[PDB]
């Protein structure tokens, strides 16, 4: 069997993007940030306190008629941006795009952190990490894309996200016309439960290619690039006025600069990201002093391939025995 289901920006800046997701019998349509960096499907609920929802679609178990109390289970997230939320764990059906998984745990939030009340156009997260991650004690649960493995005509998914515009996630399938020229493979590590991989070096704008090995995770649900400080440096020095700011906490530029692609290696290819991509817009309503789309992640212990790259690239998450990530241009 295959699924295929439309992402969407939750705003104009592509800060996330949300995915139609059907739960329980009959359906309840919620809006899901798709995470390969997290491994816990989690969503607003009738459980969740009152005051930390602010306009979202909840999840109703009761009213589901596949939904089932898996007994004593809880879970507790913290997200590497500060973000947590927490609650108790059903199990029901979870339909994406045609793909059906039944005893699927929906794990239902009875807290959540600041920052998922404000962001009123995502219901929750499903997440698409190793299984190894998932936070379900003292029983811990497999993935959406672990329990739909079996019956997929392959045993991958793919991500296509769009630029300013709709994309596409894929479950079991490649789909051949959606990219150009052939998709590059290259190793992953599953050893800290996410999708990770090396790239072979980088280029910033039209400037030589240093090969260097950065290993980093394939993550769609972070916003930017985080790389290490001298490479973020040597991109940054090519924009006139940009500067690191302590109270802004990354890199500004002023808005009317003109920014420089830059190009991360996959093996002996190339994907190169549009200097357009890396703006993120006035730091505040009215200032002409812009947000970075890359940025140093010295202070987050780990190279984070986000949004910005990805959207740049038709990206297979192939999870075979041996799980690959593949590159192609588009
Ligand atoms: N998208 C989930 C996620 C959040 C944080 C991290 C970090 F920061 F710990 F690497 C990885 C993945
Ligand atoms: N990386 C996972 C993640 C995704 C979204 C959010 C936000 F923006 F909704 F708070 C936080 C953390």
Avoid: M
Wanted: proline fraction near 4%; charge should be negative; glycine fraction near 12%.
């Amino acid at each position: 069997s295959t699924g295929s289901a439309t992402t969407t920006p939750i705003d104009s800046l592509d800060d996330a993007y949300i995915t139609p997701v059907q739960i329980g019998t009959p359906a309840q349509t919620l809006n899901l940030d798709f995470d390969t960096g997290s491994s816990d499907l989690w969503v607003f609920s009738s459980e969740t306190t009152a005051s930390e929802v602010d306009g979202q679609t909840i999840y109703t178990p009761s009213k589901s008629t596949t939904a089932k109390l898996l007994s004593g289970a809880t879970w507790s997230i913290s997200y590497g941006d500060g973000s947590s939320s927490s609650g108790d764990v059903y199990t029901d059906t979870v339909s994406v795009g045609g793909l059906t998984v039944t005893g699927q745990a929906v794990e239902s939030a009875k807290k959540v952190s600041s920052s998922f009340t404000e962001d009123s156009t995502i219901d929750g997260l499903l997440g698409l990490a190793f299984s190894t991650l998932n936070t379900v004690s003292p029983t811990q649960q497999k993935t959406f894309f672990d329990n739909a493995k079996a019956s997929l005509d392959s045993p991958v998914f793919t991500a296509d996200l769009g630029y300013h515009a709709p994309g596409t996630y894929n479950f079991g399938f490649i789909d051949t016309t959606a990219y150009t020229g052939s998709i590059t493979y290259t190793a992953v590590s599953t050893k800290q439960g996410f999708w990770e991989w090396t790239s072979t070096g980088y280029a910033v704008g039209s400037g030589t290619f240093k090969s260097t090995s950065i290993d980093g995770i394939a993550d769609t649900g972070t916003t930017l690039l985080y790389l290490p400080a001298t490479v973020v440096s040597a991109y940054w020095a090519q924009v006139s006025g940009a500067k690191s700011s302590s109270s802004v906490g990354g890199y500004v530029f002023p808005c009317s600069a003109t920014l420089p692609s830059f190009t991360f290696g996959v093996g002996s290819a190339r994907i190169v990201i549009p200097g357009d991509y890396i703006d993120f817009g006035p730091i505040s309503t009215g200032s002409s002093s812009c947000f970075g789309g890359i940025q140093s992640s010295a202070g987050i212990g780990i190279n984070i391939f986000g949004d910005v790259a990805l959207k740049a690239a038709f990206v297979v998450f192939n999870g075979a025995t041996t799980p690959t990530l593949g590159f192609a241009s588009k």
